[PDB]
Enzyme design. Structure first.
Site, PDB file in Angstrom:
ATOM      1  N   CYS A  90       0.826  -1.218   0.000  1.00 56.16           N
ATOM      2  CA  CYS A  90       0.000   0.000   0.000  1.00 56.16           C
ATOM      3  C   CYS A  90       0.864   1.274   0.000  1.00 56.16           C
ATOM      4  O   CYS A  90       0.420   2.307  -0.504  1.00 56.16           O
ATOM      5  CB  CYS A  90      -0.923   0.004   1.222  1.00 56.16           C
ATOM      6  SG  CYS A  90      -2.280  -1.169   0.977  1.00 56.16           S
ATOM      7  N   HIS A 166      -7.122   3.966   0.848  1.00 55.30           N
ATOM      8  CA  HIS A 166      -6.813   3.649  -0.539  1.00 55.30           C
ATOM      9  C   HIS A 166      -6.002   4.785  -1.171  1.00 55.30           C
ATOM     10  O   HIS A 166      -5.912   5.881  -0.610  1.00 55.30           O
ATOM     11  CB  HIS A 166      -8.102   3.363  -1.316  1.00 55.30           C
ATOM     12  CG  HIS A 166      -7.900   2.322  -2.384  1.00 55.30           C
ATOM     13  ND1 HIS A 166      -7.882   0.970  -2.178  1.00 55.30           N
ATOM     14  CD2 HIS A 166      -7.656   2.555  -3.703  1.00 55.30           C
ATOM     15  CE1 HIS A 166      -7.629   0.386  -3.361  1.00 55.30           C
ATOM     16  NE2 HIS A 166      -7.482   1.316  -4.333  1.00 55.30           N
TER      17      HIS A 166
END
Length: 236
Positions: A90, A166
């Protein structure tokens, strides 16, 4: 076999942690990351010495998100994409899509420069995450951050924050503006042609209405962890 994916990933760490990993990726000294207070008050872009080269948003995937409409987009377009396979990436894939989507600030011989060349030397096109050699560039550089050099935050408490942030980063090319949402197995998702009043990349009303669409689908608890970041020329 050493440990892997037991680490934590960068949330609410926009300034420091992004300039650390991007410099090891090959980012020249003439460019860096720097945080963003707002993009709809013109008083912030009134204090900008040089135009920012890319922008990214930090917002979690809420359970509604009905603004999405999964369809088979083009796969021969003028730009590139990669699949988010490893979940612990991520912090990696966010900076990867900021750098590779602007091949013009790379240094000859860097990790990103040889990552573009190694995919044209193999069964991949140049960006397709579908070959073993494309994944080798991802798994070896993340190995330097699952070790005791804890990226994001110390003590590696969980795989992610108390929520599921995100990372979506893009730029304008060929007179239009699109996005890179690595969650879409289908590919990128266009917004439309760029504004005639886009001051550099901040004043783009198309991508600003798209951030306003996600926060309507989210609850008051899910919009709490919201920030923005960009990659422009260094200021030191």
């Amino acid at each position: 076999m050493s440990g892997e994916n037991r680490a934590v990933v960068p949330i609410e760490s926009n300034p420091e942690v992004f300039t650390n990993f991007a410099h090891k990726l090959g980012l020249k000294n003439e460019w860096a990351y720097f945080d963003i207070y707002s993009l709809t008050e013109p008083e912030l872009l009134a204090f900008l010495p040089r135009p920012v080269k890319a922008i990214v948003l930090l917002f979690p995937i809420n359970e509604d998100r009905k603004s999405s409409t999964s369809q088979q987009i083009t796969s021969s377009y003028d730009v590139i994409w990669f699949k988010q396979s490893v979940k612990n990436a991520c912090g990696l894939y966010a900076i990867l899509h900021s750098l590779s989507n602007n091949q013009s600030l790379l240094e000859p011989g860097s990790d990103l420069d040889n990552f573009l060349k190694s995919q044209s030397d193999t069964s991949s096109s140049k960006n397709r995450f579908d070959d073993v050699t494309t994944d080798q560039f991802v798994l070896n550089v993340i190995k330097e951050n699952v070790q005791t050099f804890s990226t994001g935050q110390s003590e590696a408490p969980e795989a992610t924050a108390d929520t599921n942030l995100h990372y979506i980063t893009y730029v304008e090319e060929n007179g239009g503006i699109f996005e890179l949402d690595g969650r879409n197995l289908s590919g990128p998702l266009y917004l439309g042609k760029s504004d005639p009043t886009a001051t550099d990349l901040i004043e783009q009303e198309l991508v600003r209405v798209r951030v306003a669409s996600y926060m309507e689908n989210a609850n008051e608890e899910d919009v709490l962890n919201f920030a923005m970041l960009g990659l422009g020329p260094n200021w030191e």
